[PDB]
Structure formats: structure tokens, C-alpha cells
């Protein structure tokens, strides 16, 4: 089997991407944030505290003839941005772009934190990291990809995120028309539960490439590119007037600037992030100070190749017995 679904930016900045997902019988379609940095499929639901729902589409298990309560199971998760959610668990039929999993754990939110409530466009998350990170207790549950893998034509999914435009998640096949050149594969460590790999270095604009190992995670659920402070300083030093602002929370730059590109290494290959991809707009409405798309990881504990980086590439998440990551230009 295979599946193929379009993923769409939630706003004009590409702050996140939503993909339609069918849950239950008859289908209930919710728009989920596919997140290669986490491993829970959770949804706004009929059980969510009513004051914490503000425009989202909800899953109502009592209207699904295939929903079954997973007795005793609870979940609770906290994300790197400080947000969180928790609740109970059902199993139900879940389909993404024509690909169907029966018995998928659907984690129903009873509580969500304010940033979820405040984002009316995201109905939940669909985690695509390794199942060792799943938070269901006392019986840990598998991700959608893990459940589908054995049935797929090939044990892979691909992320093809657009810049200010829709893109595609495919399951079970590699669309050879979706990229240019060849795909360069690189080793993955699953020891922290992430799609963790080592970039071979970077360049700023037309500058020379610096060969240096950068361990980080491929995370579709993070908006920006978070890298070591030395790398980020070298980038923003090429932008007149750019500075790190403690009051804003990162590097800002004059909105009148033209930003240089940023290149990262994948083995001997190179992925080029155009300068425009690094512009996240005014810090507040009407301001002439703009927020940068490359930020320091110094306070996280891990480097994060988020959407800014991933949307410059066609990315293969290879779930073979020994997982690997593939990157191609497009």
C-alpha cells in the first residue's frame, strides 16, 4: 500500500503545516500537524475542556462505530516550546491520503495549553518520530507510520514542504519526479527517539563551506532552524543591523534587508536554503524589526533542522531495519 496527502501552511509565514486526516467511521476529518519530532497522535475532541476549544475541529468518539476506549490508558506530553496536552486514549481507524491503519491509538485531549487553544488551524498532532517516545501509559502505543510500515510497498515516508505554498507527505514510495539530482542518504541514531543525524557543515551566502560535524534532528514540527551559537553568529554577521535581542527572544534584523542564503551539508552533498526562507516577518504588527529564521540552539540541548531547513529539500524518512535519512534538492 501507499498514501499521499497534501500539507498546507497554516499562515503566510509557514509557521506550521496541516495535513487532513480521516478518523473513525463514518470519517471525521481533522487537520493535523505532522511532527517528526514527537510520537503521539492526539486530537482536540468532545472530551476537551470547553473553554480550551476555540475554533478547532473536534473528534467525537461516540459518533464513530469503530472507536473503542483503550481502558486505563492516559497520555501527557510537553513540547520544546513549552506547550502541553493530556487526556485518554481510543483505538480507531485512521487514514492519511488513502492509506488506512485499523486499531490506531488516537489520544483524545482532555486538557490543552493556551498556545494550542489560540491556534484555531491545528486540530491535533500526528507524531512520526520513533515509538519509544510515545507517552501513553501504562502501555506505550505505536505511531501511525510504525503501524502501517509492514503493509507499505517500501518502509518509508517523505516530507516535501513548500515555501509559502502547499507540499506533500507520501507514505510507502519515493516520488522520483519530486526532486532534482540524486538523494543523499545519511546515518541516523535512534538513541534519543528522534530522526537524529550529523550534518557535514555549512556555508553563509556565497562564502566558503566550513566542514564541521553538526548533530541534530530532522523535525517537521519545529518552525525554525536551531544551530550552535557559533554558526548562527556567523550567519547574522552578514546582515547589516542584525542583532540578538534578549527581550524579543532571538536574532532580529531590519525588515529592509535582503538575507543571504544558508547551505548545510549532507555527506558530500549540499542543500541551499534561500535567504527569503529565513525571513519570519515583523516581530509585532507594523514593526520594522523582523524575526530571523535561524536561531541559536544553545538553550535547547539539541540542534533542530526544522521547517526552514527541511522545506528546502525533499526528505526521505527511511524506516528500514536500520533507519536512515535522505535529502535531495528540488
Curated annotation (Swiss-Prot):
One GO molecular-function entry: aspartic-type endopeptidase activity
E.C. numbers: 3.4.23.22
GO biological process, one term: proteolysis
Disulfide bonds: 255-290
Residues of the whole record sequence present: 90 to 419 of 419
Keywords on record: Aspartyl protease, Disulfide bond, Hydrolase, Protease, Signal, Zymogen
Annotated protein name in UniProt: Endothiapepsin
List of catalytic residues: 35, 199
Catalytic activity: Hydrolysis of proteins with specificity similar to that of pepsin A, prefers hydrophobic residues at P1 and P1', but does not cleave 14-Ala-|-Leu-15 in the B chain of insulin or Z-Glu-Tyr. Clots milk
Residue span, Peptidase A1 domain: 17-328
Similarity comment text for this entry: Belongs to the peptidase A1 family.
Entry keyword annotation includes Disulfide bond: yes
